[PDB]
Structure formats: structure tokens, C-alpha cells
Amino acid sequence: HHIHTPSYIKPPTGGWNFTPANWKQNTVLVLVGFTACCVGLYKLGEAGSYNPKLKYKEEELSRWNQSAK
Amino acid sequence: KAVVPFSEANKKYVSSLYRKSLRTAHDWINKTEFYRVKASEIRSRFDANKHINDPNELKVIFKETEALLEDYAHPDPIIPPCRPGGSKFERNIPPRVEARIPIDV
Amino acid sequence: AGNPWKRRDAWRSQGAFTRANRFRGALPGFFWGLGAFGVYCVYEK
Amino acid sequence: GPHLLREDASFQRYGQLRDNLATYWKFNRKAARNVFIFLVAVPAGLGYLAYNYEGKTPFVGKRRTEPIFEQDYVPRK
Amino acid sequence: SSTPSLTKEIIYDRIVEILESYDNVKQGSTISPAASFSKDLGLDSLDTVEVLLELENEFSILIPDNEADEIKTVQQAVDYIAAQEDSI
Amino acid sequence: KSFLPHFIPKNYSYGDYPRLKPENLQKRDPYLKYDDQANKRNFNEPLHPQQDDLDMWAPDHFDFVQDSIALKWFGTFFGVLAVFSSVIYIGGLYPEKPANPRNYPFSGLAKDLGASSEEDTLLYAAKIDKSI
Amino acid sequence: MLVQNLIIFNIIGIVLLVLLNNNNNGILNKKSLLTIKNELKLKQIGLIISIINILIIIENWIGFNSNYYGFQNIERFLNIYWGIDGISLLLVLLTLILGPIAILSNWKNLKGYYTYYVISINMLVILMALNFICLDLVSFYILFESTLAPLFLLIGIYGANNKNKAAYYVLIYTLASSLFMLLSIVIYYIIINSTDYIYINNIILSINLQSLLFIGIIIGIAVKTPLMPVHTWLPTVHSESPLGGSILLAGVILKLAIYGVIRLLLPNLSEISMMFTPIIYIISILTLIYSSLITLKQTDLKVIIAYSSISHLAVCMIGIFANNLIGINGSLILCLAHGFVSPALFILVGGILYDRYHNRLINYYQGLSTFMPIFSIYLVVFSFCNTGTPLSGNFVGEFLSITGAVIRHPIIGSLTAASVLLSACYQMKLTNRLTGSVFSQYLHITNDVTNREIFLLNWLLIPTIIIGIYPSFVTNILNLASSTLIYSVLI
Amino acid sequence: FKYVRGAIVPKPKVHPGYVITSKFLGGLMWFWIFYRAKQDYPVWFGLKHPWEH
Amino acid sequence: GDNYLILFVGWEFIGVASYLLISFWFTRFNAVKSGLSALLINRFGDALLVLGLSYLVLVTGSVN
Amino acid sequence: TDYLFQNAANQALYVDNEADLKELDENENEGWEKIMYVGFVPTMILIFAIVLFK
Amino acid sequence: YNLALFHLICHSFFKALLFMSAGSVIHSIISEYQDIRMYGGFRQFIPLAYTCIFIASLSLMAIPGLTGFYSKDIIIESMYGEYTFSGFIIYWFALISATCTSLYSIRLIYYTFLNNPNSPKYIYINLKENDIVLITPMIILTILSIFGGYLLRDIYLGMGSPFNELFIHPNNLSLIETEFSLPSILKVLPLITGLGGGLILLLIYEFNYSLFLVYNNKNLSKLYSFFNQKIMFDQLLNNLILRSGLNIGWLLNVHID
Numbered sequence A: 001h002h003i004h005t006p007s008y009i010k011p012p013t014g015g016w017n018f019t020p021a022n023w024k025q026n027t028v029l030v031l032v033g034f035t036a037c038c039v040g041l042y043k044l045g046e047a048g049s050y051n052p053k054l055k056y057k058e059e060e061l062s063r064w065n066q067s068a069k
Numbered sequence B: 001k002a003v004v005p006f007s008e009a010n011k012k013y014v015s016s017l018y019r020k021s022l023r024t025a026h027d028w029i030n031k032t033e034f035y036r037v038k039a040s041e042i043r044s045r046f047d048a049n050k051h052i053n054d055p056n057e058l059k060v061i062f063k064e065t066e067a068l069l070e071d072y073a074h075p076d077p078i079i080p081p082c083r084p085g086g087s088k089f090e091r092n093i094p095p096r097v098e099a100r101i102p103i104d105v
Numbered sequence C: 001a002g003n004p005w006k007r008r009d010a011w012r013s014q015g016a017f018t019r020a021n022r023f024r025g026a027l028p029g030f031f032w033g034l035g036a037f038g039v040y041c042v043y044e045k
Numbered sequence D: 001g002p003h004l005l006r007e008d009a010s011f012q013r014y015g016q017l018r019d020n021l022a023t024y025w026k027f028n029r030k031a032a033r034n035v036f037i038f039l040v041a042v043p044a045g046l047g048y049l050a051y052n053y054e055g056k057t058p059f060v061g062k063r064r065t066e067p068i069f070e071q072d073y074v075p076r077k
Numbered sequence E: 001s002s003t004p005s006l007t008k009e010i011i012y013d014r015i016v017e018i019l020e021s022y023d024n025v026k027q028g029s030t031i032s033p034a035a036s037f038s039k040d041l042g043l044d045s046l047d048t049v050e051v052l053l054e055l056e057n058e059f060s061i062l063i064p065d066n067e068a069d070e071i072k073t074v075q076q077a078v079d080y081i082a083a084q085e086d087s088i
Numbered sequence F: 001k002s003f004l005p006h007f008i009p010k011n012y013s014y015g016d017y018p019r020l021k022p023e024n025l026q027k028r029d030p031y032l033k034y035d036d037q038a039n040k041r042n043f044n045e046p047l048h049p050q051q052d053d054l055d056m057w058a059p060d061h062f063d064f065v066q067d068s069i070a071l072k073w074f075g076t077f078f079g080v081l082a083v084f085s086s087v088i089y090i091g092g093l094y095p096e097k098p099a100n101p102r103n104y105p106f107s108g109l110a111k112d113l114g115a116s117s118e119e120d121t122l123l124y125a126a127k128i129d130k131s132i
Numbered sequence G: 001m002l003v004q005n006l007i008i009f010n011i012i013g014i015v016l017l018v019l020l021n022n023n024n025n026g027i028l029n030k031k032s033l034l035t036i037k038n039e040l041k042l043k044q045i046g047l048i049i050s051i052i053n054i055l056i057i058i059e060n061w062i063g064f065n066s067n068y069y070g071f072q073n074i075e076r077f078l079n080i081y082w083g084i085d086g087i088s089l090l091l092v093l094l095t096l097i098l099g100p101i102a103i104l105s106n107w108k109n110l111k112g113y114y115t116y117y118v119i120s121i122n123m124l125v126i127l128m129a130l131n132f133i134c135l136d137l138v139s140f141y142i143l144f145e146s147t148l149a150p151l152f153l154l155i156g157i158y159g160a161n162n163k164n165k166a167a168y169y170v171l172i173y174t175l176a177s178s179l180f181m182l183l184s185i186v187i188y189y190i191i192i193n194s195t196d197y198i199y200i201n202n203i204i205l206s207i208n209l210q211s212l213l214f215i216g217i218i219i220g221i222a223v224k225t226p227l228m229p230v231h232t233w234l235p236t237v238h239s240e241s242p243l244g245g246s247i248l249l250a251g252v253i254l255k256l257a258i259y260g261v262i263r264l265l266l267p268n269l270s271e272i273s274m275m276f277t278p279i280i281y282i283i284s285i286l287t288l289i290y291s292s293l294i295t296l297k298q299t300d301l302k303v304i305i306a307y308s309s310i311s312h313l314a315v316c317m318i319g320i321f322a323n324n325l326i327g328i329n330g331s332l333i334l335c336l337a338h339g340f341v342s343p344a345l346f347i348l349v350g351g352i353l354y355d356r357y358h359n360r361l362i363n364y365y366q367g368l369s370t371f372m373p374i375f376s377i378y379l380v381v382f383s384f385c386n387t388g389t390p391l392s393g394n395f396v397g398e399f400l401s402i403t404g405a406v407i408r409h410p411i412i413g414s415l416t417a418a419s420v421l422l423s424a425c426y427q428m429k430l431t432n433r434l435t436g437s438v439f440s441q442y443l444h445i446t447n448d449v450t451n452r453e454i455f456l457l458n459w460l461l462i463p464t465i466i467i468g469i470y471p472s473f474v475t476n477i478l479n480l481a482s483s484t485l486i487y488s489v490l491i
Numbered sequence H: 001f002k003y004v005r006g007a008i009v010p011k012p013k014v015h016p017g018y019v020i021t022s023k024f025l026g027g028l029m030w031f032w033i034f035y036r037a038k039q040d041y042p043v044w045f046g047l048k049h050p051w052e053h
Numbered sequence I: 001g002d003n004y005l006i007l008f009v010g011w012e013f014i015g016v017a018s019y020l021l022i023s024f025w026f027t028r029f030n031a032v033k034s035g036l037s038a039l040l041i042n043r044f045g046d047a048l049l050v051l052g053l054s055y056l057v058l059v060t061g062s063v064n
Numbered sequence J: 001t002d003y004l005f006q007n008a009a010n011q012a013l014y015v016d017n018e019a020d021l022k023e024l025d026e027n028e029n030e031g032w033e034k035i036m037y038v039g040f041v042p043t044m045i046l047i048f049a050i051v052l053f054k
Numbered sequence K: 001y002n003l004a005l006f007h008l009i010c011h012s013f014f015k016a017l018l019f020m021s022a023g024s025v026i027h028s029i030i031s032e033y034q035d036i037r038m039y040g041g042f043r044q045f046i047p048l049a050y051t052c053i054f055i056a057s058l059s060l061m062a063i064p065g066l067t068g069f070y071s072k073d074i075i076i077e078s079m080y081g082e083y084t085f086s087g088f089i090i091y092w093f094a095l096i097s098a099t100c101t102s103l104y105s106i107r108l109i110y111y112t113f114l115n116n117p118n119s120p121k122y123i124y125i126n127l128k129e130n131d132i133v134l135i136t137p138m139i140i141l142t143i144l145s146i147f148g149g150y151l152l153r154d155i156y157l158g159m160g161s162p163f164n165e166l167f168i169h170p171n172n173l174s175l176i177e178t179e180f181s182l183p184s185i186l187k188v189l190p191l192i193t194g195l196g197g198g199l200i201l202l203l204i205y206e207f208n209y210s211l212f213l214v215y216n217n218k219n220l221s222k223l224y225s226f227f228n229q230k231i232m233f234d235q236l237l238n239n240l241i242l243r244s245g246l247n248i249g250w251l252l253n254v255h256i257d
């Protein structure tokens, strides 16, 4: 088709329609790694998230306002 | 340079004006049937002055023609996408083919 | 010559490019929508 | 090593001219006008503004003490 | 799918249709690749320009004035259209 | 037709530097062949002292109409909208409010809008519903 | 346990390199083995010396107390008292870090005399580092101007075509101005009999004398940051000095002026610093605005980077002269961030492009991403860091400096926000040109960024991102030290 | 592929999926337009209020 | 983001990513200059956005 | 010990070979890798550790 | 703020559909032309792309029953319902904007799908619809461009709906005077100018195209050129603002530095 000089030009993103011969093997290695990070993010997100509208009762807010007066 | 009627140089110069006349007409008129009327009208305005012998008279018409083209010029002319000024011009130009020259950096 | 391109521009207004064929379907599924709405009215009586 | 850059004489003369514009500078009336604007007129404008509002802008926690909206509506009729 | 490439066989089948549909072409004037414009087809200065404008419109290109003046036969037009990556 | 951009000097004397007519390389014919096709420049062609204002990397120059004519139209367009707006205002043709603007109870919701007492009632309340 | 170990080890290091290389100089016509591979074994020893210097300050860093007010690690050496506080500690670390980076930049791009270059670089790093830990004006001035002698010879020997002009500029601009600072120092030693930091901070001089002292000190500082209109020496020096000289000059030397404001102006001339603050802002704002516009018309690749440093340090001067903690901390953060990004831009320009094509004109370069993708990645990333894009330490420094300026002066300090637009105008126009369009017709295809140049760019990028995302590593050390510089009486 | 000189373009015969999908998408819109008109044409033009029934 | 500074982080990288997307075909001159035009005009707004956040800290001492 | 204890006769033989052998000829084994990855990179890790776990 | 948010959500759906379908037309034509003057008669050759454009255009034109109608028509009404001088003026600007919104949608559709063919015959014999992968997002957006606004109207435009994130001062709540006090004519005026104005434009194009040969009239040529060059703002921005800003650096470089 054309000449892309791929012998030395090897960018991280491929360089003119690049697909390695062992692309199937690496794709599985990436999908498992990608799946292992979404689950880790989910566990971190659930354990770290909180509801900012429920951390204090309205009775507690009344005492804060009265003391601040 | 003086104008030489019925010469080879004049034919290219006149044909250059004729292309600009019809290409301008194509920009303004977006329908083929309406474009043919204007295209034939321009030629009827071109053949009428074909039998002119005096270079001095011919200079005025060339001056006149180059002013109508500038006056009627479309602000958004039609350009082929891969031609200069087109949408796909200089898109994904293939890299220059040349062997690398190593250097001991 | 008057329109020296008559025989070249003929296809631009014939067959698929006639005035009838160009607009025959300018409203996609207008009558299909009428039928479903007409059927819906009977189903709601 | 291999002289990977194809040196251009016009580029070199253009580059040399830009790096040595000071050689041909003349303190004429055009130059004096530009010098006055950038080094005297503009600094004076900032100089006046800087000291005009120096210590006159207590914006830390500035409070509103004037109602924003109108109480009663007066019709145009 | 995209255009099924563009070989000189399909290029010639489209330029010939332009000449056939041009009434200003001289009577007879057999259309062959070796045929010229001024002599074989009977085209003056302005008529040839109109043919070239249809030629560039047909393949959706723009022909510069310098290159247009070097196209005087039918085979030259076929070769000129072939030597262009943007001929569709 | 084409014209040079602003702030391009007519003359210069930089010693023995060659003096050439200032040319905007953006306006050159693109169907010609150049050594540097992208910049429309041939090798060893001399450069204007301000060539950076007259090349492809410079801001694109618009030469369809003159700047004075282009600014005359620009002012005319907004001038029409200015007169149209002022006439309706001075003439007072815009419609009147059909009803009294919305009112609210509890001294115009003063307490709910950050007011503390009767001193600051008018500082925070909305339009007060005088009809209870 | 700091200055004594740092000076003695480096002096021994200097002697060690001199003994080895100069042993066979006696018209021996010898070949020797130390000189094999462009004096590799002599460059390696000097590189090891720079690394050890970093470990020396780290040992003292372990014992540093961030909750202690006043100077720590107080030491008497050469009849001079040396001490470290929060501000001094971070600036010393930056200076020593750039040691190995500067040496590694000129590893195999010098025509010869590597041993002389290595000794000069290490000498400059130590002298500048010692200038942050001296506890009196006289010792400050001695180290402030001692760096001129190694730097003058370094530029004149290893410089570019105009090295002679650059050597005269740096020697004369930085000495004629520093002499005016010496006059103020001499006045202190005459009327107070001491130039100690702590001693002079508690003394209030007459408002007229403080004006005279401030002007003398600020002339030496303003030339060194630099500020307009005494900045014209810096573009010439950067465009001609070697890459390692540019790294030290852009990464350390220009930061001595900001540190000089901290030591010589704020705590001892506090009353007159408040009065001079509007004048300093006007000069620095014009320095920021003018330099950005001047950069738009430059054609030399390395000169463009030189002018970019002027605009950023104008923000540092604006932030450090704000009388609030936000502006002071932001100025110090921006100095550290500039200490990494600015050398990287010189490395990309004067160390990667120049070492291959040897031409610094901008017209020869365009579309470099076609055959140099790794170069373009770092060029784009460092371009955004230089423009104050978030996630970089420059943004944290610039935002806090701008915020502190607005707090100090809401009206004219708001003009500092123009750095967000102006910096992107000249920096991206250069980066957009170097990466856009087709590959240059004046360049031959050659090697991309090598492993050595990758190492330099990565380890200058890493500190910038860490400071940008979590600047609390820097703020915690600075908070107690920086709070002492504020002068206000709220009643 | 061969090009036929002087042949007018007839009605295109697209794949049946495209034609059926296009009509159904239009049929969904037109039916929904009429369905809302049957139930909201008074309120749309202000001729009646939503609660009035 | 729960504060204006986190908003500003997305605000800037929106222009960064758009600059890399408009000039994706960097071999085309028009795309290269168009991407620069989008970036510099958006940076003009960013300069004012920084000034607004600084005034927010001046008046309220927070961006939350 | 070859850089300091070798005599003149042995040293000169190595250098003459090295210039000729190098002449008979990418960007690797420059002599900095071991120094930086053993001295500099662990030093930066220690700085990272200090700002983290002090 | 509730009106702006709801129109923002709805606009994200049918405007993305327009760009996707516009890019589908460019890929369908072999020459990859982007000028509508070179299009014509695509309606039969690419009907699936035409329907996506047609449905998106009607949603954009606030045709009643569609998502745009429930999101855009209320905002235009809110200008008159404000009952102030500025709101009344903006109402006319919005009303003309609504009229133009239908005008350029009909003009774009006619040139691309209904006009007489302008591209070469070789283009039409190779004009085909794209693959399913390109089509799939467009169909999903097409359905969301019909029913999305109706389902989400009560969330954002319902009276009394809790949206405390968007604060509306009590003195600034005009959702009542906009909904009730409006004359019945204003409720349909954008519709009449849209559909009725669009039909007039369509009739002129098909049968009396000689009117739009604006290169004859001098005033029409200037008026066409002025708006085709985008109010000359690009020329003013570059030739005056950007050039002068660069010259200031040149003056600073030459006379100062």
C-alpha cells in the first residue's frame, strides 16, 4: 500500500496501522488486567464513598447553630 | 508586456479568464439547468469579442474582464476535497521515504 | 449554441431524479404512522 | 558528523539579521515615541492605579448591607 | 464499498461519454484514444476549455491552467486522470 | 484583490541585508511545485525581515473585502439592532406585566432567606405578601 | 555535619580528579587509560561525586524538625555560622539534584576537556548550595558572586559561536549590579557592626535609610531574577552557554534572587518592603507582559526558552512580595517547579535538536512528530507544564502566586492572571509549529530520543507531577518558615 | 465493473433492511406526533388547561 | 468535582484534549492552526477563570 | 588497578588498539547506566520515602 | 436554570445525531465531498441516513411531540413570560432564531437529499449506506430524539420539583406567568413561522430558483457575502486584533529589547 518506515519508528500508539502477530495473547493479558482494575476501583469506591447529607442529624445542627450564636 | 492577439500566449490568457468565468458561475448557481444558461451566456459574451484586432482595444477588455471576475467572485468557492484548499487536503500524507542516518548522540 | 450539454444533463432529471421520484418518500413512514394511529383509535373505542 | 541539516543561506541571513537588529537601531522620533509609551506612559498608568487603590480595597469577607430586589412594583400605566 | 479502483478502462469509458454528449463536436469525428481535439474532433479554443471543465467535474478534480494547456488529445486526458490520487 | 497585512513596512535599511518587496506566502499559487511544498517556498529564496508575519505559520489573512468596509458592515449590523432596541424602549411598546409579581408569606419569607430579626427583614425578604 | 562534610568531600573530589588527569601532562606524549572513551573514567568519578552530595543533605534532612521555629543544624565553620530552615532545605535539595542532571546532559557532546567541565559543574553546584545555608549578609554575598569565576570560564570555553559576548554579559551584568548590593551590606556592618541574619532582623532603621538599603539590594536582585529592564543579558547567555551551564543558570541561579528577597529584604527591611510593593508589582507585571509578547517574535529556539523563564520568575517575584502566606508559599512552589521544567525545555531544544542538527533557527524545524514521536511526547507534556496546566507543579505555584497577589492588591494584582493566557501564546505556538505540518524538508531522518536523554526528561518530569498533584510534601516544610516573613499589625 | 455510456440512473434498489428500518423510524415519530396531538393539542395552543377535563 | 479547582482541572484538560483532537491530522496545515485557535481562545477564558477563583479565595477563603 | 598500576609499555598498547578498533565500526553502554540506577534512582526513592513515611 | 439544564440534556441527543448522520453522508459519497452544493438527490440512495437527519431536524425545529419541543419551546416562551424590556427584545431574537432554525434545516435537507443531482453520475451508481456499526448509535439516538424529552420533562420542568442544586430566588420564579399569562397566539407563533416559513423556502427553491441567483443584485451579493463570511468577525479578529498583538511584540522587540 505505502511505506511507513516501521523498522525504527515505534510509537506507543502503533505507527500507521500496527498490529503485532501476537495481538490475541496480549489482548487477553490486557482484558484480565483491565478487569482487575475496575473491580479494585469498585471496592475502593464503595468503602470510601459516603452520604454528605446523613453524617449529622438535624438535632446536631441545631446545637451547632445555637452555640455559634 | 504587450498583448499579442491571435497568438499562443493570448489563447492561454483568454482561456484562463474563461475558466474563472465559468467556475465563478458554478459557485453561485447550484442547479445545472440554471448553470447552463449562464455558462452559454458567458461564452456568447466571449465569442462576440473574438474578432478584435487592435491590441490597445483588447487591453481594455482584459482590464474589464478581470474586474468583473473580482466583483462576482464567490466568497466560498467550490473546491475539491483533496485539492489545495479542500477539506481533505494534506490529510494523512504518507511519510517521506528515506533511510535513517544514525548518529552517536 | 443553446445548451450544448442537453444530451449530458438529461440523466439529472430522469428516472430516479424526476420531480415525482425525488419527493416520493420525503416524509418517511407518514402513512405508516397514520395507519398505526388509525389502528390505535379503533383499539381505544 | 553527517551534517543532517541542509543549511540554507537565506535562512542564515534571516537568522543573523534577527539576532543583530540592535546594530541598525536609530533613536529617531518613531523610536522615541515607542520608548516613551512602553517605558514611561504605560508604567505611569499602572503607577497611578497601583497607589490610587493601595490599601483601599477591603474585600476580605465583604458584607452586603443593601437590598438587591425591589419591594413594590410600580406599573407603567 | 468504496469506488472499485480506477483503471484506464473505466476512465476511458467516461471521457468518451463527455465527447459524445457534446453537440459542438464535429460531425463524424471518430472517438479514439489517439484522437486529438482541435483537428480530429473539431474544437476551437473555448470549446476545448468547456470539455476540460466537464473533465475536471466528472472526476471531481481541479486542473491548473498550466496542466490544462498540455492536454490536447484523448489519450493525454486518460493518462492525466490516471496520474492523480484524487480521481474519483 | 489581495493586499498586505497591517504593520508591514514599505521600506527598511538593515545595513547590507537585501531589500525585497514584502510578499505574503499564504497568497502564493498552491498548484505550483516548490522545494518546500507545505510552506510554498523554494530553497535559498530570500526572506523578508518580517517574513514571520508573511508565511503560512502567520495568522491567516482575509482579503475578500477591505478592513474599513468589513468594519463598516460590522458596525452597521449592530447599529440596526441598537436602533431597533432603543425605539422599543423609548416608545415603551413592550407589554406590561399582566399581574402583580409573585408574593410570599411570612414577611416575604424573610426568616427563610437569611434574615435574623425585624431590623434585617427588608435586607433579605422577597416581595412581601401584604394581603396575609 | 553538613557544610564541613560538603566542602571537605568536594575539595577532596576536586583534588582527586586533578591528580589523576594531570599526572602525565609533562610533555609525555602519552596515551594513558583514564582518557580512553572521552575520559569516561573521569566523568564517572565526577558523576559519583554529585550523587554523594545529595546524600549529604539527606542525612541532615532526617533530623529536620518542621515544627521548630528558627534555624536548625547551626554550625560554625571557617569563622562562619551555617544553618537550615524550611525554605533553605528545599532549595538546597533542588540545587544538588540538578548536579548529576547537568553533568549527564553533556556526557558525550563536548569537544574535550571533560574533567575541567565536570569540576566546574560540581564546584558551581556546591557554591550555589552553600549560598542557601549561610547565616549572614557577607557570607551570602561571597557565595553569591563566587560562582561568577567558574561560570565565566565555563561559558567562554564550552560555549557556542557567540560565547565571547555571552561571557562578557554574565560577568559584567551580574557583578556591576551585585556591587550595589555590597554597598548596602557594608552599610549594615558599619551601623550595626554585624551582618547576621537574626541580628539585623530585629533592628529598625530610619525610613530614609531603609529606602537606600532596599534600592541597593534590589538592584542586585532585579538583575539576577532577572527583571525588566535589566534582563537583556539572560537571553544571550542561554543561547550561547553549554547545556549544563544553562541548566544550572535556569534551575538554580535565577532562584537565588527569590531567596535573596527572603533573607535580605523581608525580615530586616519590612517597613520599606510594604512601601516598595506597588513598585515591585508594576515592574514585575510589565516584565511578565512584555517578555511574553517579545517571545512571540523570537526565531532562536533556545532564546524562546530563555524568555519563558523571565515571565515565570516575574510571577515568582510577584508572589514572594505578597504579604500573605498564600503568595509566599506559591512563589516558593513555583521556583521548585520551574527548577525542573525549565531545564527540560533546554534539554529538548539545546540538547536533543541541537546535538543532532546544530542549528537553533526555528525555520528549519516542523512536523517532528513524524520521525521523532518520543521527542514530541515529552515536548508536548513539558509545554503544558510550562504553561501552568494543572497536575503540574507550575500550576500550583502560579495559582497560589496569582491568588496571593490578588489578596495583596486586588486591583493591579489581578493583572497577574494574564500569565495564564500569555504563557500559552508563545509556548504553544512553538510547540504547535514543531509538531504540526509535514516533516521539515531541511532535516535528514536520524535517531529519536536515546536512553540517556529519556532518563533526563523522565526524572525532571517526575518531581513536577508529584509536586503538582500533592504539593503538601513541600507546603508542610515551608509553612512555619514562611509564616515568619509576614509583616502586619491587625487591631 | 463496467460503465455504460448514456444510461440514466434508475430507481436505486437498496438493501431491504435499510428501507424497512427507515420507514419504521419515521413511523415511530409520526405516530408519536399524532398520539401527543390527540392528547395535548388543547394545552399546546393554550385553548384549555391540563386539569380541565 | 466538589470544588471549583477540581472543576478547573477538567476545564483545562478539556481544552488540552480538544486541541489534540482538532489537530489530529497534524500533517494538514489548517487542522494544526485550527487546533491552536481553539486552545488559545479557550486559554483566554481560563485566564479569567483563574482570576475569578482567586477573588473567590479573597472574599470567602475557599473554593468549595 | 589497570588505570593506576600499569606501566607505560602496557598502557600504550591498549590505547592504540582502542582507537583502531573503534574506527572499524547504538547509543548504549555509555558508562552512566550503572551509576545512575544504583546511586541516583535509589536516592530519589529515599527522598520519596522521606516525604511519605517521616 | 432548570430550563437551561433540560434543554442541554435534550440538545446533546439530537445534535449528536445530526453530526453522526452528516458524517454518514460524507462517507457514503465516494468523493467525500462536504459542500452541500455538490450534493443532490440522495434521498432514495441513502434513506436510512435521511430519516435520521429528518427526525433530528424536526426535533431541532421543536416540532410538537418531540424532545426539542418540550425543551426548546418553553425557553422561547419564558422570554415573553419574563415581562421585562430585555426579555421582550430577546424574545424576538429567539423567535427569529427559531424561524431560522427551521429555515436552514429545510435548506440543508433540500440541497443534500431533494435537489437535482450535482455530483457526477459515477457517484450515484456507487452511493450506498454504511455498515451496521455506524448505524447502531444513530438508531439509539434517533429513539432518544423522539421520546426522551417527554419522559424527562417532569424531572426538570415540573413545578415544585426539588432541584436544590440549582437555586432560584423567590423573586425570580416566572414559571407561572410564562405558562398561563401567555397569549394563545405566541404559543404557536414559532410553529407557524417555522413550518410555514420553511414551506415558502421549499417552494421557492423547487420552482422559482431564479430568485436565489443573488450574484445579480448588488445589495443581495453584499448581504450574502457579509453573512457567509460570518459577520466579518474572523477577518476583524485576525487582521486587527491578532496582527496588532503580534506587532506590539515586534515593537517591544525592536525598540525596547
Ligand SMILES: CCCCCCCCCCCC(=O)OC[C@H](COP(=O)(O)OCC[N+](C)(C)C)OC(=O)CCCCCCCCCCC
Pocket (backbone or CB within 6 Å): A009, A011, A012, A013, A014, A015, A016, G369, G370, G371, G372, G373, G374, G376, G377, G380, G381, G384, G435, I013, I016
Ligand atoms: C491526564 C493526561 C493523561 C494522558 C495519557 C494519555 C495517553 C498518552 C499517549 C501517548 C502516545 C501518543 O499518542 O503520542 C505519540 C503518537 C504517535 O503517533 P501514532 O498515533 O502512534 O502514529 C504514528 C505516526 N506519526 C509518527 C506520524 C505520529 O502521536 C504523536 O507523536 C503526537 C505528538 C504529540 C503527542 C501528545 C501526547 C499527549 C500529551 C498529553 C498532555 C498532558
Ligand SMILES: CCCCCCCCCCCC(=O)OC[C@H](COP(=O)(O)OCC[N+](C)(C)C)OC(=O)CCCCCCCCCCC
Pocket (backbone or CB within 6 Å): A012, A030, A033, A034, A037, G374, G377, G378, G381, G391, G450, G451, G454, G465
Ligand atoms: C490495565 C492498566 C491500565 C493502566 C495502564 C498504565 C500504563 C503505564 C505506561 C506504560 C508504558 C510506558 O511507560 O511507556 C513509556 C513510553 C514509551 O516509550 P519508551 O518506553 O521510552 O520507548 C521508546 C524508547 N526506545 C525506542 C529506546 C525503546 O515512554 C514515553 O515516552 C512516555 C512519556 C510520558 C507520557 C505520559 C506523560 C503524562 C504526564 C501527566 C501524568 C498525569
Ligand SMILES: CCCCCCCCCCCC(=O)OC[C@H](COP(=O)(O)OCC[N+](C)(C)C)OC(=O)CCCCCCCCCCC
Pocket (backbone or CB within 6 Å): G011, G014, G017, G018, G021, G022, G025, G113, G114, G115, G116, G119, G120, G123, G149, G150, G153
Ligand atoms: C571549592 C574550592 C575550589 C578551589 C580550587 C579548585 C581547583 C583549582 C585549580 C587547580 C588545579 C588545576 O589547575 O588543574 C586543572 C583542572 C583539570 O582539568 P584537565 O582537563 O585535567 O586539565 C587539562 C589538562 N589535560 C588537557 C592534559 C587533560 O581543571 C581546572 O582548572 C578545574 C578547577 C578550576 C575551575 C575554576 C577556575 C577558576 C577559579 C577561580 C576561583 C575564584
Ligand SMILES: CCCCCCCCCCCC(=O)OC[C@H](COP(=O)(O)OCC[N+](C)(C)C)OC(=O)CCCCCCCCCCC
Pocket (backbone or CB within 6 Å): G165, G168, G169, G172, G173, G174, G176, G177, G219, G223, G230
Ligand atoms: C545597575 C545595573 C547594572 C547592570 C549592568 C550594566 C551594563 C553592563 C553592560 C555589559 C558590557 C559588556 O558585556 O561588556 C562587553 C562589551 C562588548 O560589547 P559586545 O556585546 O561585544 O558588542 C559591542 C562590540 N561591537 C560593537 C564590536 C559589536 O564591551 C563594552 O560594552 C565595554 C564597556 C562596558 C562597561 C560596563 C560598565 C558598567 C558600569 C556600571 C553601571 C553604570
